Amino acid sequence: DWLKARVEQELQALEARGTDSNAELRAMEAKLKAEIQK
Numbered sequence: 001d002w003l004k005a006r007v008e009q010e011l012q013a014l015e016a017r018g019t020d021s022n023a024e025l026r027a028m029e030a031k032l033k034a035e036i037q038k
Contacts, residue, residue, distance in 0.1 A: 001036075003035055003036060004032070004036075007032055011025070011028060
């Protein structure tokens with residue numbers, strides 16, 4: 001479960017200064033659980 005945070009800090013600084021990724025956000029949540037499986 002802690003990994004869920006490992007991902008937040010990841011897209012946290014990226015989306016914090018990225019004005020061109022308000023769509024790929026969804027495709028991201030998909031890989032989210034994909035990581036929990038390992």
